[PDB]
Amino acid sequence: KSEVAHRFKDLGEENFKALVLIAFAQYLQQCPFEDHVKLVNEVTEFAKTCVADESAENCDKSLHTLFGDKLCTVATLRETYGEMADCCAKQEPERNECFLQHKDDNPNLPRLVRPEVDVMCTAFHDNEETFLKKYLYEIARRHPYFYAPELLFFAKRYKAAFTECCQAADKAACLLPKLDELRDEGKASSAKQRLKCASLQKFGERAFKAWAVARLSQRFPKAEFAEVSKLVTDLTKVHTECCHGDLLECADDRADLAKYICENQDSISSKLKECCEKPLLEKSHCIAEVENDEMPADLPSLAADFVESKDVCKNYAEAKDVFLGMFLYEYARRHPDYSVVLLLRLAKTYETTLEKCCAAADPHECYAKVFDEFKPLVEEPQNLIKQNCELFEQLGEYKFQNALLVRYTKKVPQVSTPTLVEVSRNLGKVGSKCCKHPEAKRMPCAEDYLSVVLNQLCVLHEKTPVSDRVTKCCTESLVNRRPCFSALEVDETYVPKEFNAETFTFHADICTLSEKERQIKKQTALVELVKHKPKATKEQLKAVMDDFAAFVEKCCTCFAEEGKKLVAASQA
Ligand SMILES: CCCCCCCCCCCCCCCCCC(=O)O
Ligand SMILES: *N1=[C]C2=[C][C]=[C][C]=C2N2[C]C3=[C][C]=[C][C]=C3[B@]21[O]
Ligand SMILES: CCCCCCCCCCCCCCCC(=O)O
């Protein structure tokens, strides 16, 4: 079975010529684009010889072998990959394992910098195949562990924005907003894939399955616990393998899970019809982002089996993870409106309760009212979402972001100004995205988007530690991470920042700037305003903000004239 030829079929020549490009670009991050093009063309030509004759020359070697063979022929030594060239002296599965250990992950590559809209649409027109292929090359060499089929999914959406906006009226009003959402979603996926690999190693796979049972029970409410438990086991085995870095081994386990799910749709979900009729690449991908199946009508209460029962301590003791997983599965399938972390708080609370009750003379009397403990935990994110979405409606996205700047700078003023501006604007975005949902779908939307922003804040703070309270909340636990950040009181031991005079100086270049960039600096100064006087309160801050609005809108030169009056007047 010639694997290079079989891969070429059922996957398509176009997807083959793109995955081979992403694959080699993830290893040879230093080699130029045109050098990569020949290698993809050479592998494509060689694959075509195996397509025309499966038992031809060098067509009997498997995927890792021909990959490793072609990779060890590029004068890899002395060209950055000196150590990676030493992998050639090994053989499978040591040579490929050696290749994975030498992915740079942090290559000293310049910021990509997008060209002008007219330049891109012209380059996209005159040479579309070369234009898009350079896009895959430049992104794959900077994200060496980004799952290649997933990176290919973004390339299609990248091309869809160019075909529509390049033949339009105001192209920049069409293309540029699509590219930013595309680039933002690309960073979110990259950080999500890493957060899940780090969560697997830091906290162990016992807690990883708990996250998977809850999410899968919400996704597949019409599935038995045994099916959900098997899907969680296989899904964990896939993530454990895909975090090693090997694309080929990750893809095969990822395709076997989709095949099993499509063969057992009648015992998993009713919403996997059009999902399972997609090709190999999209099948595994679409199932990951599948809508929750309809909840089974007339589901009994969890009072019977988990709090009343007759004897439940015996059931919990023999399997202190299965019985907790059955409670999590039954609670999650009934509450698709809860976040995954909320359901884990209820289970962990139900866990700590049983161990204190089953360690008592009358365990039943100890756990007789365990469900009263869940009400405060369910109402805590609900009140936070409603209090913040309502404050978002009466403010708009911008003024909601500024209310978050003041609130979070006063909590941790030690955080750098560019990080406080970035995190607060992204936290305002989850308001513009999730408050447009009803209460039945607001908590999961917030959980998914907050997990992206809160992790981005942590990885920035991890590389440059600054606050102990940010460090504790960032390394506590992924279940208690959000309640940790929301429980931060304002910093009382913080000494006010010194009045840097130039920081509050503006120069009328902000008059004609950029709607984002103009308010980036308008929000940067607001952070520096709060850092200088951390005891200003909203009334005085709304006064200085109102005084700045009249100073900026009118005097737009005078920025030094009226500016000096503002600084002295604000000193109050
Ligand atoms: C975001 C891209 C990650 C790439 C590696 C993913 C490895 C594991 C993904 C395999 C899942 C296949 C679909 C499983 C169906 C479960 C749906 C769900 O994830 O909630
Ligand atoms: N992702 C995500 C997350 C976060 C935190 C913790 C954990 C986790 N995990 C698990 C699962 C299941 C299903 C789907 C997805 C997922 B992940 O990986
Ligand atoms: C910089 C500190 C960020 C703190 C984030 C507080 C934002 C609160 C908004 C409502 C939180 C909703 C969380 C739902 C998921 C969960 O149960 O934690």
Question: 316 with 324: CB under 8 angstroms?
Answer: yes
Count of CA atoms in the C-beta half-sphere (13 A) of 510: 22
Nearest to 442 by CA among 456, 426, 453, 431: 431
For ligand 3, whether the C-beta of 486 sits within 6 Å is yes
Within a domain: 355? yes
Clarify whether residues 278 and 317 are in a common domain.
no
Within a domain: 278? yes
Question: 109 with 29: CB under 8 angstroms?
Answer: yes
Rounded-to-integer distance, Cα 45 and Cα 40, Å: 8
Q: Which two tokens stand for residue 269?
A: 């979900």
DSSP state of 495: P
Nearest to 197 by CA among 257, 146, 231: 146
Among protein residues, the one with the nearest Cα to ligand 1's atom 11 is: 288
Closest atom, ligand 3, to C-alpha of 404: 1
Instruction: Tell me the C-alpha to C-alpha distance, in Å, between residue 250 and each of 229, 245, 256, 258.
Output: 21, 8, 10, 13
Clarify whether residues 352 and 396 are in a common domain.
no
Ligand 3 centroid distance, CA of 467 (Å): 19
Q: Which two tokens stand for residue 150?
A: 């997933």
Q: Which two tokens stand for residue 209?
A: 């399955």
Measured from CB, residues less than 6 Å from any atom of ligand 1 are 147, 150, 189, 192-193, 215-216, 219, 235, 238-239, 242, 254, 257-258, 284, 287-288
Rounded-to-integer distance, Cα 72 and Cα 412, Å: 50
Among protein residues, the one with the nearest Cα to ligand 1's atom 14 is: 288
**Residue recorded with tokens 């290749």:** 99
Ligand 1 centroid distance, CA of 288 (Å): 5
Identify each DSSP E strand in 521-570 by its residue range: none
Nearest to 152 by CA among 278, 16, 249, 18: 18
Rounded-to-integer distance, Cα 414 and Cα 497, Å: 9
Clarify whether residues 414 and 482 are in a common domain.
yes
Question: 457 with 421: CB under 8 angstroms?
Answer: no
Nearest bound ligand to the CA of residue 153: 1
Nearest to 73 by CA among 106, 46, 111: 46
CATH number (domain holding residue 416) = 1.10.246.10
Ligand 3 centroid distance, CA of 428 (Å): 11
Among protein residues, the one with the nearest Cα to ligand 1's atom 4 is: 147
Nearest to 132 by CA among 112, 160, 100: 160
Q: Which two tokens stand for residue 199?
A: 């969560």
Count of CA atoms in the C-beta half-sphere (13 A) of 25: 28
Q: For the chain, percent helix, then strand, then coil, each to nearest 5?
A: 70, 0, 30
Phi-psi region of 207 (alpha: psi -120 to 50; beta: other; left: phi over 0): alpha
Terminal-to-terminal C-alpha distance of the chain: 80
For ligand 2, whether the C-beta of 175 sits within 6 Å is no
For ligand 2, whether the C-beta of 405 sits within 6 Å is no
Nearest to 459 by CA among 481, 480, 444, 443: 481
Clarify whether residues 217 and 132 are in a common domain.
no
Question: 397 with 427: CB under 8 angstroms?
Answer: no
**Most ligand 1 atoms within 8 A of CB, residue of 26, 154, 257 to mutate:** 257
**Most ligand 1 atoms within 8 A of CB, residue of 185, 217, 220, 284 to mutate:** 284
Within a domain: 195? no
CA angle 524, 525, 526 (to 5 degrees): 90
The answer, yes or no, to whether the previous bond of 496 is cis (omega within 30 of 0) is: no
For ligand 2, whether the C-beta of 208 sits within 6 Å is yes
Clarify whether residues 122 and 184 are in a common domain.
yes
Rounded-to-integer distance, Cα 228 and Cα 215, Å: 10
3-state secondary structure 322-359: HHHHHHHHHHHHHCCCCCHHHHHHHHHHHHHHHHHHCC
The structure's method of determination equals X-ray
Question: Where among 161, 189, 217 does a domain terminate?
Answer: 189
- Cβ neighbors of 442 (< 8 A, separation 6 or more) are 385, 389, 434, 435
Closest atom, ligand 3, to C-alpha of 447: 15
Clarify whether residues 404 and 479 are in a common domain.
yes
Distance, CA of 114 to chain centre: 23
Helices (H), 103-224: 117-126, 128-140, 148-165, 171-202, 205-219
Count of CA atoms in the C-beta half-sphere (13 A) of 523: 30
Rounded-to-integer distance, Cα 397 and Cα 564, Å: 30
Rounded-to-integer distance, Cα 299 and Cα 285, Å: 31
Ligand 3 centroid distance, CA of 482 (Å): 5
Question: 262 with 276: CB under 8 angstroms?
Answer: yes
Among protein residues, the one with the nearest Cα to ligand 1's atom 10 is: 254
Clarify whether residues 386 and 374 are in a common domain.
no
Clarify whether residues 89 and 151 are in a common domain.
no
Q: Which two tokens stand for residue 285?
A: 């991908």
Instruction: Tell me the C-alpha to C-alpha distance, in Å, between residue 98 and each of 30, 226, 245, 438.
Output: 18, 38, 11, 50
Among protein residues, the one with the nearest Cα to ligand 3's atom 12 is: 381
Ligand 1 centroid distance, CA of 285 (Å): 7
Q: Count the neighbouring beta carbons within 10 Å of the beta carbon of residue 480.
A: 15
For ligand 2, whether the C-beta of 220 sits within 6 Å is no
Rounded-to-integer distance, Cα 508 and Cα 192, Å: 40
Question: 527 with 417: CB under 8 angstroms?
Answer: yes
> What b/e sequence results for 535-572 when a residue is b if at least 16 CB atoms lie within 10 Å of its CB, and e otherwise?
ebeeeebeebbeebeebbeebeeebeebbeebeeebee
Instruction: Tell me the C-alpha to C-alpha distance, in Å, between residue 206 and each of 200, 233, 441.
Output: 9, 11, 28
Rounded-to-integer distance, Cα 31 and Cα 24, Å: 10
Phi, psi of 436 (to 5 degrees): -80, -5
Single-letter amino acid, residue 172: A
Rounded-to-integer distance, Cα 522 and Cα 548, Å: 9
DSSP state of 299: P
Q: At what angle do helices 33-52 and 63-71 cross, to 10 degrees?
A: 140
Clarify whether residues 365 and 387 are in a common domain.
no
Domain that holds residue 49: 3-100
Instruction: Tell me the C-alpha to C-alpha distance, in Å, between residue 285 and each of 207, 212, 514.
Output: 24, 17, 37
Residue 129 exposed, middle or buried by CB count within 10 Å (0-12, 13-18, 19+): exposed
Rounded-to-integer distance, Cα 351 and Cα 355, Å: 7
Single-letter amino acid, residue 348: K
Within a domain: 298? no
**Most ligand 3 atoms within 8 A of CB, residue of 346, 384, 479 to mutate:** 384
- Cβ neighbors of 170 (< 8 A, separation 6 or more) are none
Ligand 2 centroid distance, CA of 323 (Å): 21
Ligand 3 centroid distance, CA of 29 (Å): 38
Clarify whether residues 268 and 334 are in a common domain.
no
Within a domain: 216? yes
Rounded-to-integer distance, Cα 473 and Cα 428, Å: 20
Nearest to 243 by CA among 145, 312, 149, 335: 145
**Residue recorded with tokens 């906290």:** 203
Instruction: Tell me the C-alpha to C-alpha distance, in Å, between residue 479 and each of 284, 291, 327.
Output: 27, 23, 17
For ligand 3, whether the C-beta of 420 sits within 6 Å is no
User: Structurally, how many domains does the chain consist of?
Assistant: 6
Rounded-to-integer distance, Cα 323 and Cα 302, Å: 13
Within a domain: 196? no
Q: Which two tokens stand for residue 2?
A: 């010639």
CA dihedral defined by 209, 213, 219, 222, rounded to 10 degrees? 140
For ligand 2, whether the C-beta of 239 sits within 6 Å is yes
For ligand 2, whether the C-beta of 213 sits within 6 Å is no
Rounded-to-integer distance, Cα 430 and Cα 543, Å: 27
Rounded-to-integer distance, Cα 294 and Cα 297, Å: 8
Within a domain: 112? no
For ligand 2, whether the C-beta of 159 sits within 6 Å is no
Question: Where among 350, 378, 406 does a domain terminate?
Answer: 378
Is residue 244 a known part of a binding site? Answer: yes
Rounded-to-integer distance, Cα 427 and Cα 75, Å: 47
Count of CA atoms in the C-beta half-sphere (13 A) of 22: 27
Distance, CA of 444 to chain centre: 14
DSSP letter for each residue of 14-46:
HHHHHHHHHHHHHH-SSS-HHHHHHHHHHHHHH
Is residue 237 a known part of a binding site? Answer: yes
Among protein residues, the one with the nearest Cα to ligand 3's atom 15 is: 447
Is residue 246 a known part of a binding site? Answer: yes
For ligand 2, whether the C-beta of 559 sits within 6 Å is no
Closest atom, ligand 1, to C-alpha of 254: 10
Clarify whether residues 53 and 146 are in a common domain.
no
Nearest to 492 by CA among 551, 410, 409, 408: 410
Helices (H), 394-416: 396-409
Ligand 2 centroid distance, CA of 211 (Å): 6
Question: 214 with 344: CB under 8 angstroms?
Answer: yes
Rounded-to-integer distance, Cα 280 and Cα 6, Å: 13
Distance, CA of 182 to chain centre: 13
Nearest to 305 by CA among 374, 371, 227, 214: 371
Question: Where among 486, 520, 540 does a domain terminate?
Answer: 486
CA angle 175, 178, 184 (to 5 degrees): 135
Question: 134 with 94: CB under 8 angstroms?
Answer: no
Q: Count the neighbouring beta carbons within 10 Å of the beta carbon of residue 496.
A: 12
Within a domain: 334? yes
Clarify whether residues 85 and 164 are in a common domain.
no
Helices (H), 337-496: 340-357, 363-366, 374-393, 396-409, 417-434, 442-463, 468-475, 481-486
